[PDB]
A paper describes a structure:
Immunoglobulin E (IgE) antibody is a critical effector molecule for adaptive allergen-induced immune responses, which affect up to 40% of the population worldwide. Allergens are usually innocuous molecules but induce IgE antibody production in allergic subjects.
Here, we report the X-ray crystal structure of a house dust mite allergen, Der p 2, in complex with Fab of a human IgE monoclonal antibody (mAb) isolated by hybridoma technology using human B cells from an allergic subject. These analyses revealed an important conformational epitope associated with the IgE antibody repertoire to a major mite allergen.
Author numbering:
A (entry chain F): 1 to 129
B (entry chain C): 1 to 133, 140 to 161, 168 to 219
C (entry chain A): 1 to 209
Amino acid sequence: DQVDVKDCANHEIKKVLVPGCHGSEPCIIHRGKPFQLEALFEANQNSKTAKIEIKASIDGLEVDVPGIDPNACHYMKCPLVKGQQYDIKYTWNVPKIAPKSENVVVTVKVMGDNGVLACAIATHAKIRD
Amino acid sequence: QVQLVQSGAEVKKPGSSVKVSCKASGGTFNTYSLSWVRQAPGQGLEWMGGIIPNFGRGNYAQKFQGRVTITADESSAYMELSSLRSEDTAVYYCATFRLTGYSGSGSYWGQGTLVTVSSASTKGPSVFPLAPSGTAALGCLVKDYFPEPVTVSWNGVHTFPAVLQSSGLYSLSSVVTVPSSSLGTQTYICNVNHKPSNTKVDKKVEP
Amino acid sequence: DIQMTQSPSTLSASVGDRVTITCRASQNINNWLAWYQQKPGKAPNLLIYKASTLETGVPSRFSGSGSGTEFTLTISSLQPDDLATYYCQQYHSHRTFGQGTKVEVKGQPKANPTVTLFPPSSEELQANKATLVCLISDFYPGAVTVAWKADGSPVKAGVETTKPSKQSNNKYAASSYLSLTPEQWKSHRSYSCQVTHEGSTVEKTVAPT
Ligand SMILES: [Cl-]
């Protein structure tokens, strides 16, 4: 379902979906299991480029997020047109050895030709078996 | 038992850099976060930084960002501090904490590493016996060393904090209280370790 | 950066009193707050984690509570073992320690010092030096004055005396060292180490012999 995220830009993200999660309830990310995410956003600029930057922290300490394609133009039709809406779907592979934590912060930032396209912070994710 | 063993105390010149090591035994840093915390003498605990070993890079307090590097695998962690100044004189500790997805504190501390930033050379102590003259009191005088710390053992035991002379050198004493009758028939040696000068000295204390 | 404001910096109370230490976070840290106790001369030890969870082996007198940015540590009945410096630490974003609260435990019985005085070793004299060593233990409260005499005359110089420091049994120790030439040591009939604690003087004397 739709999950709650905090916008760190200008409300370009319209919706974030995660099958099996809802609103601001704890969203369990299961180790060794695929995790599906969908985002719908409005382009705030014409841009040839969309570069995705993921910062993640476990118990207030930054951790590397593996298996992320930085070129968001791989998952939608670039160049982006200002004011058009783009739907991006991605399945992330959760490592079987992922550190179990009840305090996970994920910040996803998409940078365009002229600065930020989109920014969201998700604080409800919990990594469990 | 989970034990974190740290590198021994040392003297570092101003403007040099120090690399402190923290080795886990009886377990691993897997399921734990690792942090480096410093305490200057008479001052409070300060968090330099921390890491989730094998899952992330070093995280740093902005006061220390760019001068501190922390690196770590499941059995060794390191803290490197560069451009050392007098204000960096401190006991450096490594400390674990269980990740929140597991049970228990998983809180363990290293023994701490006294780093002295100073222009003065290390100087090993002279060890002298304190001959005894209900009970009798014997020990040894650990005289004119730099920097701290020294450690003492024997073969009931009181090790006194060091005095600092105007010379800028330290001196300390350790005391064992024994029955008068055991003096004639038992041997007392004190074992003084001064790691920063690599010095180990054993001295016989007899009447 | 999350800042931790800890109050008070110093707390004085008697055995059996209830003491409360407060820690405020500059922003939300959820329940990610820890409390550590550092006894004098020792490494920090965890008492509480997740705001209210007691570490294994911590006495029940210790309790933790909070309002999400406001957190409190309570000792329901202060004991002599509780003399220590207590530090809050947030672990929600990076880690930040409070300034610490030094807890002083008052109202304990007086204890007078045990005094042990050692003359210079034959071995130090061989090295052309002479140190008299005066060791002071098991006193409470943790203040003493040391006067050195040569043949009854005050020695104002070559005296080095430590501040008092806590023993593991909650009494205090200190050391006084007197630096002499071997000529000064053999040329005087005696030297005395005189320790005064709360108006009681314990005098120990040594002579070259
Ligand atoms: Cl800190």
